[PDB]
Amino acid sequence: QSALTQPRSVSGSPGQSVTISCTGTSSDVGGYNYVSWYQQHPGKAPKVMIYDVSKRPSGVPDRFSGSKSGNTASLTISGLQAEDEADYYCCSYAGSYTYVFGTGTKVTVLGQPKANPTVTLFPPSSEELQANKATLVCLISDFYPGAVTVAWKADGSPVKAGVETTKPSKQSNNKYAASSYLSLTPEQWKSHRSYSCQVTHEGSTVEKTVAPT
Amino acid sequence: VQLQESGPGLVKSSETLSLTCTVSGGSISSYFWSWIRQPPGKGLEWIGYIYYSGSTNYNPSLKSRVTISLHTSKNQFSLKLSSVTAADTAVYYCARHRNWLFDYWGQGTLVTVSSASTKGPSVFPLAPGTAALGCLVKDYFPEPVTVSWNSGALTSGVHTFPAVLQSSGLYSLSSVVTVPSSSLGTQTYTCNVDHKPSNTKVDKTVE
DNA sequence: TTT
Helix, strand or coil: CCCEECCCEEEECCCCCEEEEEECCCCCCCCCCCEEEEEECCCCCCEEEEECCCECCCCCCCCEEEEEECCEEEEEECCCCHHHCEEEEEEEECCCCCEEEECCEEEEECCCCCECCEEEEECCCHHHHHCCCEEEEEEEEEEECCCCEEEEEECCEEECCCEEECCCEECCCCCEEEEEEEEECHHHHHHCCCEEEEEEECCEEEEEEECCC | CEEEEECCCEECCCCCEEEEEEEECCCCCCCEEEEEEECCCCCCEEEEEEECCCCEEECCCCHHHEEEEEECCCCEEEEEECCCCHHHCEEEEEEEEECCEEEEECCCEEEEECCCCCECCEEEEECCCEEEEEEEEEEEECCCCEEEEHHHCCCCCEEECCCEECCCCCEEEEEEEEEEHHHECCECEEEEEEEHHHCEEEEEEEC
């Protein structure tokens, strides 16, 4: 089945509220009330925060609440505290003894002003082309919050195959950076007129383009 | 009550990945017993679960490859994932599933899928207000590699990215430096790549 | 076989 759709990034200052959506289908999220939510801090196992749409396990603070509307579940965190910064996954029963997890949302508890990413797209080096290989390298730097969506295009047309993207990691200056690689053959690289790396960060999109030359 | 995964961290391509979960402080005579995985930097993926009575139910996209078994005399349950490729590289978690939720999770075990022998990286230049430049450190195994710039003298604006494991079973990473564009072709910028597992060092001046 |  298809993973449940979540936003990549949600954010708020300490004391504010955020809501995370989790969109499924009528055969999972909107088919049962067996929706659960999981919190994951770096390097740790997921930890259950909500089950049966709206119930809290013992020990989970009351600032976490769950709800549902049609085929969309929502996790709401009121009065954000610094320790709420983590990844959050919804999960739903999906019929005939199966479960499907959502794609995950990074919750950022804002401690800096937001920073837009600087995007540099490198074409394959002539040295790499001589090695009968081709990698486009899309470098994304100096952004906050640390969550970004990367999409690749070949002559304005989405390219899903041969894409590898790194989870954003903190730079030495406390903003984030991420990287995406599009792996092609030299012939693929030469056959197309243009290639683009499209970076989406907090509503805004930055696009860089490169062509064989 | 506690679950913990045991078994190897490195499996060869096209072989069977085997893990065991040992339950302590509790029996396996109730509930469901589940496996979930998470590729590095990506989302959770349910693999399957087994009911205490033996009934197995797996993710439909992994069905023909997955075996979950109970071992009651050891209070364990196991996972076998056949036909493994680099795409199966993930943190594998066991978890108890009770009353429609996953409540006690193991710490997880990273399983890397590769039949790669030790190999040193190819280093390719990422040639350039400010300008970004870098080095693509490609097709090495195993981790780690360390990258410095100008023998550690240049640290401002430097960022080295986490490694990606490609479909080949070999790792790649990039390291980048943001410098003033007026210094290009006068200042030299050299990435020093150190791959101890293959006894390899590469210096690459990028221009 | 199976909350």
